[PDB]
Curated annotation (Swiss-Prot), chain A:
Variant or mutagenesis effect after changing P216L: In NEDSCAC; uncertain significance
Organism: Homo sapiens
Mutagenesis / variant outcome for changing V199A: In NEDSCAC; uncertain significance
Biological role: Component of the Mediator complex, a coactivator involved in the regulated transcription of nearly all RNA polymerase II-dependent genes. Mediator functions as a bridge to convey information from gene-specific regulatory proteins to the basal RNA polymerase II transcription machinery. Mediator is recruited to promoters by direct interactions with regulatory proteins and serves as a scaffold for the assembly of a functional preinitiation complex with RNA polymerase II and the general transcription factors.
PANTHER family reported in the protein's UniProt record: 34 KDA TRANSCRIPTIONAL CO-ACTIVATOR-RELATED (PTHR13130), MEDIATOR OF RNA POLYMERASE II TRANSCRIPTION SUBUNIT 27 (PTHR13130:SF4)
Any GO BP: RNA polymerase II preinitiation complex assembly
Chief location bin: nucleus
Annotated protein name in UniProt: Mediator of RNA polymerase II transcription subunit 27
Keyword entries, A-Z: Activator, Cataract, Intellectual disability, Methylation, Nucleus, Phosphoprotein, Transcription, Transcription regulation
GO cellular component: core mediator complex; cytosol; mediator complex; nucleolus; nucleoplasm; nucleus; transcription regulator complex; ubiquitin ligase complex
Family: Belongs to the Mediator complex subunit 27 family.
Curated annotation (Swiss-Prot), chain B:
Localization terms from the record: Nucleus
Residues of the full protein shown: 703 to 828 of 877
Family: Belongs to the Mediator complex subunit 16 family.
Source organism superkingdom: Eukaryota
Task of the protein: Component of the Mediator complex, a coactivator involved in the regulated transcription of nearly all RNA polymerase II-dependent genes. Mediator functions as a bridge to convey information from gene-specific regulatory proteins to the basal RNA polymerase II transcription machinery. Mediator is recruited to promoters by direct interactions with regulatory proteins and serves as a scaffold for the assembly of a functional preinitiation complex with RNA polymerase II and the general transcription factors.
Name assigned to this protein: Mediator of RNA polymerase II transcription subunit 16
Protein species of origin: Homo sapiens
Quaternary structure and partners: Component of the Mediator complex, which is composed of MED1, MED4, MED6, MED7, MED8, MED9, MED10, MED11, MED12, MED13, MED13L, MED14, MED15, MED16, MED17, MED18, MED19, MED20, MED21, MED22, MED23, MED24, MED25, MED26, MED27, MED29, MED30, MED31, CCNC, CDK8 and CDC2L6/CDK11. The MED12, MED13, CCNC and CDK8 subunits form a distinct module termed the CDK8 module. Mediator containing the CDK8 module is less active than Mediator lacking this module in supporting transcriptional activation.
Amino acid sequence: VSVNLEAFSQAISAIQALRSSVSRVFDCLKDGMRNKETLEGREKAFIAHFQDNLHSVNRDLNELERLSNLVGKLYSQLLQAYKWSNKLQYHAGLASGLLNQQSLKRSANQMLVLPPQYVDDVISRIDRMFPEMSIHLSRPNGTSAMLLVTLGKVLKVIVVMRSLFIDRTIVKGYNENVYTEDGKLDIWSKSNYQVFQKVTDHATTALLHYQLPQMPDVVVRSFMTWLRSYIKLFQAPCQRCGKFLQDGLPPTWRDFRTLEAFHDTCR
Amino acid sequence: EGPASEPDEALVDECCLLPSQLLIPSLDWLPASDGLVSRLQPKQPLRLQFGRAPPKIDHLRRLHLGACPTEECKACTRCGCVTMLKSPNRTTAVKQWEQRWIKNCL
Ligand SMILES: [Zn+2]
Ligand SMILES: [Zn+2]
C-alpha cells in the first residue's frame, strides 16, 4: 500500500518544519533589534513579526493533526539485486521525452494492397473492451466492410469503410429498421431526426479533422473514442450556457482534444 | 619579583583539561583603530570626504544588544569604545563606576 506511505510525507516534513519554525521563533526574538531608520517602522513591525512566526508555529502545529487524523497503520545482500529492475522502469521513462506527437513537418512533395483479414484484426483489437457497445462486421457488397454498432439501448450506427480507410458513418436511434426490406444494410438514407442530422455534420467535420496520412487506425480509434462520449447524450447540460436547450437543442458538439458537450453557438 | 618564567607543561596539560568542561565564551578587544593612526602615511595623504566612512556589544557594561541596537552613546573619541549614554538602571546604580568615565575614557 502507498496511500499511507505518501500521506506520511506531509507529517514527516511538518515536524521538521515545526523544529525549524520554533528555531526561527527562538533566534528572531533572540536577534535583538534591527531599527532600519525609523523606530515606528521597527517597533510596530516587532509585534507584526512576533505574531507572524508564532502564528506560523501555531498553524504548523494545527495542520499536523489533520494530517495525523487521515493517516493509518543474504539478510540484506540479495536485496540489492531486486530494486534495480524496478528502477529500470524509470530508465524506460528516461528516454521518453516530451516531444511526443508534435513535429515540424514541411510540405511533403519531393524536390498498398492489404487483406480484409487485416481489417478484421484491426477491428478485433478495440472491440474487446467497452462491452456496452457492439460491433458486427459484414461485407455483403465487395471486400469493403460496413459495420453495425449498437450502443446499449440508445443508438444504432452504420459505419462504412472502403479500401481499409473510412467511407461513411450514419447514426440513428434504437427503435428503427436499420436494415432494408431485403435485409441488407441501408446505404443511402437519412436519420429522420433534427438532432441526429445536426450531429452527422459534426461527425463529417470530425472525420476530416483526424488526419493521419499513413496511420488510419488511430484515426478511427479516436473517432470511436469521440463517439463514446455520445452515450452521455441527453444527460449532461452545456458547459457555458448552463441550460441544456439552446433554441431547443441540448449540447452535443464535443470540442477537438477537449471532449465536452457544446452547441455550434456554444462552440 | 620579576620572574620571567614560562609556566611548566604540567600546567599546560591541566589547561588542556579545560575544554573538557569550559569553552571560551567571548572577548572584547578594545583597540579598534577608528582613528587615523592606521590610515595615513607621510607623503601618502588621503583626500577624505564627509560621511563616507571607508556582534555590537557595549565596551563598558556587559549587556548584550541586538544586531542594530537603538540606545545612544557618547563618542569616546580617544579609543572608540561605546561610552553608552543612558544607563539601564539609575535608581539602583553604582555612583563611581559610571561617574569615573562620565566625561571621557582613559
Ligand atoms: Zn450550450
Ligand atoms: Zn574609550
